[PDB]
Amino acid sequence: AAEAGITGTWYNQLGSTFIVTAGADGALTGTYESAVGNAESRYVLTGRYDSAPATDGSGTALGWTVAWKNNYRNAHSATTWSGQYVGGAEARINTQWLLTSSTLVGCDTFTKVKPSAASIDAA
Amino acid sequence: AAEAGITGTWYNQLGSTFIVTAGADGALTGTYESAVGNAESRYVLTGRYDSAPATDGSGTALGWTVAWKNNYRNAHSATTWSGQYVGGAEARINTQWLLTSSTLVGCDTFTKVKPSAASIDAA
Amino acid sequence: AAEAGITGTWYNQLGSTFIVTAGADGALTGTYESAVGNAESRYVLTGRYDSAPATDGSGTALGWTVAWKNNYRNAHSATTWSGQYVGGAEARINTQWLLTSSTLVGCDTFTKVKPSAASIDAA
Amino acid sequence: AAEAGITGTWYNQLGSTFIVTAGADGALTGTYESAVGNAESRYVLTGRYDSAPATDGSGTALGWTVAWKNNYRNAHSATTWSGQYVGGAEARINTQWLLTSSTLVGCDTFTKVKPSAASIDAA
Ligand SMILES: O=C(O)CCCC[C@@H]1SC[C@@H]2NC(=O)N[C@@H]21
Ligand SMILES: O=C(O)CCCC[C@@H]1SC[C@@H]2NC(=O)N[C@@H]21
Ligand SMILES: O=C(O)CCCC[C@@H]1SC[C@@H]2NC(=O)N[C@@H]21
Ligand SMILES: O=C(O)CCCC[C@@H]1SC[C@@H]2NC(=O)N[C@@H]21
Ligand SMILES: [Cl-]
Ligand SMILES: [Cl-]
Ligand SMILES: [Cl-]
Ligand SMILES: [Cl-]
């Protein structure tokens, strides 16, 4: 049920856009558009998720990587996100990330709805 | 020159084995075998690297993900590594990692030679 | 102006309570009460902050440590928080933390007002 | 036995010097001299450790903070270290750290002996 839940479009607290297809055998493929930093437009992402998550109602483990080179620019950097997908009406991906240029750390919360402009200003 | 340098087999300070092919447009694909934790044999990895790194002699940014499910076992977890490839006679990948089951953090140093059994015992 | 701004009581997104006095020469002393984990009541904290922060309107760097032993219990663990104090009407301390038992990572946002019960349920 | 083991002088893999007294009730006080970054001479540190660690032979949890202002300079930054003290003939403090200016992450291994000049060059 993780494949159906994960596949689609996600927005983090900054308004960045995470577009992902979850493959049957645990592949993540898609694009990432960061609302911040030395980035513009979409970047290729790839990653992995647990395609047979535990039937005890907990989260699905996943992670992905973006190297910050596209046709617009090259930041000479890469970010990995590591976290858990939880489904339901308020579906979320809770992540910690590492950005290497020298490794910055932080956390991103992704949901299926764009956060309000006021919340984007706050976070 | 990053593609030629990255592609191949890497060992971390724990004796884990990282087998990777760097694709021309920035893809990382391969297998990971962890010497520790709830893991055995090889796991699929995918990731990204900067395929046009800066010509100022610094490192190449990269990252990859392993979800810890294979035909032997499923740990219901995923690790991302984020770091820099530096080439030369003592080529290295310096990484920080995030393991999500609840996110553990650490650091792995990968080289082209297996560390000595005595160093593996130490680290 | 950092001393006046920092000294007082702070609540994170989980409803944990951070009570701190900022000393003139950069000392942080006080108590921490975690709303979660293997903890109850208040624990001694100590830390440091930049007592002469830059006059360019940016944040004040700080960090503190709690070892999770008090008169109620001992979790045999310790957390450090590292982050920035920003003042004003919506004063905040943005932190990343490391909990060592084996090091967990996360992020806590502290403000001068308790988050709503509904937000505490969410975060 | 943690108090006796911790108190003293420690060197990390970079040759930085960590001088600490462990207090009876779990206080850490001392100085830190970083071999790298925007730092020179010694900086005040304070932190906490588990003063009644588990009798099952495992590590002692601890953490400390340095704000990077002294009489020589002010970097407008602060680092926290979080980790475990293990005693014996090859006594060590294994740490992860967070440096906030915007939070960098890494790991430091401290021992009672200075690493060789050749190892300092490597790490
Ligand atoms: O500045 C760079 O080097 C590239 C852009 C990085 C943007 C980071 S990645 C982590 C965080 N989450 C986001 O959606 N954007 C920032
Ligand atoms: O225990 C698990 O959940 C799966 C195995 C995780 C092994 C970790 S990943 C980070 C670190 N580096 C390694 O080579 N192995 C450990
Ligand atoms: O479980 C333990 O070992 C002690 C309690 C730890 C609580 C953590 S510390 C980081 C995070 N922020 C909080 O306010 N509480 C949790
Ligand atoms: O550059 C600064 O802002 C102050 C110096 C920071 C030095 C860091 S702290 C973590 C790491 N471990 C060390 O011994 N030094 C570096
Ligand atoms: Cl797949
Ligand atoms: Cl490619
Ligand atoms: Cl003071
Ligand atoms: Cl004490």
Residue numbers in the entry:
A (entry chain A), B (entry chain A), C (entry chain A), D (entry chain A): 12 to 112, 122 to 143
What does the paper say about this structure?
Wild-type streptavidin is a tetrameric protein with four identical subunits. Each subunit has a biotin binding pocket and can bind biotin tightly with a dissociation constant (Kd) around 10−14 M. This binding is considered to be irreversible and has been applied in a wide range of biomedical and biotechnological applications. Each streptavidin subunit contains eight antiparallel strands that form a β-barrel structure. Although each subunit can bind a biotin molecule, each of the four complete biotin pockets in the tetramer relies on the donation of Trp-120 located in loop from the neighboring subunit (e.g. subunit A needs Trp-120 from subunit D and vice versa).
A second approach is to create a mobile 8-amino-acid-loop (8-aa-loop) mutein in which loop is engineered to have a completely different sequence but retains the same length as the original loop in wild-type streptavidin. To avoid this complication, the H127C mutation was introduced to two constructs (8-aa-loop mutein and ΔW120 mutein) to create 8-aa-loop-H127C mutein and ΔW120-H127C mutein, respectively. The mutein with the lowest biotin binding affinity (1.9×10−8 M) in this study is the 8-aa-loop-H127C mutein. To assess the conformation of the 8-aa-loop-H127C mutein, the protein was crystallized in the presence of biotin and its structure was solved using X-ray crystallography. Using data extending to 2.0 Å resolution, the structure clearly shows that the mutein crystallizes as a tetramer with a single subunit in the asymmetric unit. Biotin is bound in a manner indistinguishable from that of wild-type streptavidin, but there is very little electron density for loop (residues 114–121) and its neighboring residue 113. The lack of electron density suggests that the modified sequence of loop confers a significant degree of dynamic disorder to the loop. In this case, the loss of order in loop of 8-aa-loop-H127C mutein allows for a much larger rearrangement of the A/B dimer relative to the C/D dimer. When the A/B dimer of the mutein is superimposed onto the A/B dimer of wild-type streptavidin, the C/D dimer is rotated by 11° relative to the position of the C/D dimer in wild-type streptavidin. An interesting feature also clearly seen in the crystal structure of the 8-aa-loop-H127C mutein is that a disulfide bond is formed between the Cys-127 residues of adjacent subunits at the A/B and C/D dimer interfaces.
